[PDB]
């Protein structure tokens, strides 16, 4: 899944 700081 996406990293904590992604998007």
């Amino acid at each position: 899944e996406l990293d904590x700081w992604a998007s």
Partner: antibody
Amino acid sequence: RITLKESGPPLVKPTQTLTLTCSFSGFSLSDFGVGVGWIRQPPGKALEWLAIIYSDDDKRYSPSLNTRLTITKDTSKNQVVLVMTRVSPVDTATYFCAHRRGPTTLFGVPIARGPVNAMDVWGQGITVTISS
Amino acid sequence: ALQLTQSPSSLSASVGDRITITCRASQGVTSALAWYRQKPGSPPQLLIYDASSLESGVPSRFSGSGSGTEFTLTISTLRPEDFATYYCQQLHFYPHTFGGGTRVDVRR
């Protein structure tokens, strides 16, 4: 100044539980956005990512080692503990704990997420050998 | 899952050389990539964060470029302390995978 240091048993037998402790200073695990991860390096091989824990207590693990790993923090003692169960000889490696920066803030408000894209300060590493 | 492939896996050079090391991701990782230098018997040291940002206290000869799937680390004028192993790390997806490493040794 930020410093991290790993502690634990230098020798562990197969099927046993390995408890590793990352003692730190320079930051608090109660500071916004901060993370502490664990990375291993088997003799003469590449670095392998293991797990990470953040200030809000969110934890993430390597899918390959998920069932065997448990990461926890003790904010008051400035420590992060990694527990690896059912160890086998392939887990013989140097284990490193590392700091992850949170976003750069302006008056407490996050303005740059760039500094989070790395593990900036690392501990010396602890050499663990698994043999019966 | 996501694979980080480093190229070349081994490199030979001399003091004063300009070397480039490449790291390629199987899927787009935006700018979430870091470069580390690891000296024998020492922990990895951060060189570049966020693909191109120079880490504080790290010498000017190190520079990183690229975004998405193609990333490069260049050392302008190789110094004797640069003969080591280099690693790239992806931090856009969990797990935060590391590349296989690139060994930089003395040419002869």
